[PDB]
């Protein structure tokens, strides 16, 4: 259920990001149509500029949160699949790299780290050979639906929106802007 | 079939290392008994000191090349075992890491490197989870005899004398002195 929990977390994050970008687009089109009009309304255009700026900041933050949630759900799926599969095949995987496993319990910390790094490097060449052979494969059978729905990669729109970042001072300034807009808009 | 070559290389390296060790022991014991003896030939003492130092250098080099051969044969055995293991159960391994392996062909250098790094982190966490329970195992069935006869790690006597490092000029002058010793003892 934990994988399902992360899946629905990412789904509602995606929904929030989508509605945020829809609101941003509506604000932008309203601003441009008002600018096309003959009315001056300097205060109106200034407040619309502030609104669109804070809304695009919110869209960027939502995209970043969606990226983090997607990474989290992929990571938890990876860890659970690896745990269950290795439990099903503990002996085979252990004997594959056996000569560097005995004595691990009492091994010194530096030697322990060096041994596990050597094991990872040994698996690196197996992964390289597997990708060189380039066999076609899909997600795990047990959670194929969740992994297909979550997508192999996040949407490119979130990638380009999250490409640019902001300094923490601007982050907190925009957080205050969001708080005040929510406060004065609820009335 | 390079495993057999590595095995016999390790065997003859061990034989040469034992020969160097026993000849060094003989040289040092005869030097000690001549020191305790009534003889006062200072030239004999100086030449015995030269023999002792050159034999110590030869033993150090033999230990170094034995360590290199042992690590080489261990790497070859690990590579072969992992290769046949992935040829046996590699599809399930690829499925377990599917969320970061799809479309590897068209990925750029940075994307491929990051995906490989994430896969290494995943397998590292799986390995540490497996090692947490401390499930004891043995050597690989196909090549158990070679691993047993080469040992899990080289003995202390092969590393305790190899903890001293020589500058390249020292190595060159010791090589020249060893060549002179061989030339003078051949006649």
From Swiss-Prot, chains A, B:
Coiled coil: none annotated. This is Polarity suppression protein. Pfam families: Psu. The keyword DNA-binding does not apply. It comes from Enterobacteria phage P4. Late protein which functions to suppress polarity of amber mutations in the late genes of the P2 helper phage. One of its GO terms (biological process) is symbiont-mediated activation of host transcription. It comes from the Viruses. Keywords: Late protein. The keyword Nucleotide-binding does not apply.
């Amino acid at each position: 259920t934990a994988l399902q929990q992360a899946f629905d977390t990412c789904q509602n994050n995606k929904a929030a990001w989508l509605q945020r970008k829809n609101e941003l687009a509506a604000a932008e089109q309203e601003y441009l149509r008002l600018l096309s009009g003959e009315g001056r309304n300097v205060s109106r255009l200034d407040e619309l500029r502030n609104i669109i700026e804070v809304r695009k900041w919110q869209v960027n933050q939502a995209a970043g949160r969606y990226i983090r949630s997607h990474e989290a759900v992929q990571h938890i799926s990876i860890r659970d699949r690896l745990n269950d599969f290795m439990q099903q095949h503990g002996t085979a995987l252990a004997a594959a790299l056996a000569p560097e496993l005995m004595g691990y319990s009492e091994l010194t910390a530096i030697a322990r780290n060096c041994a596990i790094q050597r094991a990872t490097d040994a698996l690196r060449e197996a992964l390289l050979s597997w990708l060189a052979k380039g066999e076609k494969i899909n997600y795990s059978a047990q959670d194929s639906d969740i992994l297909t729905t979550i997508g192999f990669r996040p949407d490119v729109a979130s990638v380009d929106d999250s490409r640019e970042k902001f300094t923490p001072a601007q982050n907190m300034i925009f957080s205050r802007k969001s708080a005040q807009l929510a406060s004065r808009q609820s009335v």
